Design a protein. Sequence first.
Lengths: 69, 69, 69, 69, 69, 264
Amino acid sequence: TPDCVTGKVEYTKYNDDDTFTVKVGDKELFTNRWNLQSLLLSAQITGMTVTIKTNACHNGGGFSEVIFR
Amino acid sequence: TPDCVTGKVEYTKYNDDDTFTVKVGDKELFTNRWNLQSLLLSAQITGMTVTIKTNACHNGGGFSEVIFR
Amino acid sequence: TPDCVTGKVEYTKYNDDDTFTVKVGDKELFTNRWNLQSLLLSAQITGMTVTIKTNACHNGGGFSEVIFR
Amino acid sequence: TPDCVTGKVEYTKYNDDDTFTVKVGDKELFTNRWNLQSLLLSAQITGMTVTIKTNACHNGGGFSEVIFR
Amino acid sequence: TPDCVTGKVEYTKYNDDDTFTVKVGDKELFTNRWNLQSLLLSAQITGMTVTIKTNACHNGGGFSEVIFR
Amino acid sequence: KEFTLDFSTAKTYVDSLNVIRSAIGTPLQTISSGGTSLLMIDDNLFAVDVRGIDPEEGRFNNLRLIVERNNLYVTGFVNRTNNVFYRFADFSHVTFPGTTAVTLSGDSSYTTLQRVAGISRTGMQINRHSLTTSYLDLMSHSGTSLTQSVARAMLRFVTVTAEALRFRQIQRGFRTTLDSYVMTAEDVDLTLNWGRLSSVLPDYHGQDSVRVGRISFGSINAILGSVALILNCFPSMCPADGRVRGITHNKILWDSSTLGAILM
């Protein structure tokens, strides 16, 4: 999957429907994998840089694979 | 859902009925999603500012959406 | 449920019957709610002050409600 | 159960078989309890001293009781 | 299972099929266990040194067993 | 308002580095061993005159890096031959007496500098040679753009000047070449952890150990052999209010941010 945004996690949102929304960079992406939830808050809590990789590279696109550096 | 309250986490409460209660601001809402319990306490511990979203925007009001900032 | 003990966790103990003991104040109660296990170890590690609201407020008591401050 | 070893967790092995060894003291002891392994990796990760009580107190020994300081 | 690579974790990456990738040493190896996902994510966050035993000690190798030192 | 950095010897160098820390920051008797103390910094700018890349000759002397006191930001480099100060795009309004200003097309973040120079700090090598080389590409830069050549050279000087200024561990490993340094990953983690260490360290009260993120100190002496100078808590480099606080448990001091992340 191609690279979408790389950066620090601006804010994370836990949705009504049980999907997780992230803002890393200028994109606001989401995922329905219950596993990225706390991996993604951890990342944000500690200020890691995360690359999110996706074909839906735009506000509302969803994601499955991230790199945590 | 609309925003209800926003602020740092005053204290969290594990209840008898297995729900979790958060006091963000002057409001004291609660939730019935298990995944939130961990998220909410790390948010409390570390000092993030969370924004709760619900129409039960009142004391004893329930909630399922959160913004961790 | 009335308040019953308040303070910072002294020691936590996982027992042979899979229940989790907490010594807060001079009380030494226990609980059998799996989710409380983790959370309490975290409150203990971070030095939070907890209030345990129980009716069986005495050594050997059983609890279910906690307020994390 | 007599306390058997006391100290920090020198190391853990997460095996294939889902058995789980820990080395505290001069002993490599295992446990299969529900959640106990998890609670023990946080004790390792953050540096807690723990005491494992047991009568099978010797390498290869099993344990189900553990105090967390 | 023979040792394959001991060292700190450089990056991790959560793939689409749901397996977690860890890079330690000069190898990138992966795993299907959903529990490691997070202990690996924490080893990375705290600079821990870990050994990875696997019979598939090459890039892309899978592993199931870890020892956190 | 201008200190020197004499790269003649490993002594001339450390001796100068000491001159600047002693000059811009006061100690903390709370953190002290063997008569070394942790110094905490305490706004403005000041020049640092680079000098001694080939002591025999004494030729390479018109480099001067402008530095910002409170955060040790390297706002850019002055060209004593023509007095043009080239500032990074994030310091487009910074100015230094006695110079004209010309704004570079890139900002100072490592993210960018590493992007442009096309190199990663982890593993970066540095010796007398590269530093000489690195001085020439800067000296010969005329223009607006932040090119790959100014990029690679600023990665290097920002490293032996501000990184080494802040960290006793990077000066020590680098000092040697002067009498080829490879910047380890361990040295990189440290640079990334300057602001959380600075929020915690003051809480040091005699705990067995200190852990901030991917960094741990086993004793006071380990805190000293690595960290020389800290922030006092031009955007700030400190983390915000109420957030990062050291939390002590079992004689271990932690930064609340890292414990919050590992406990869920």
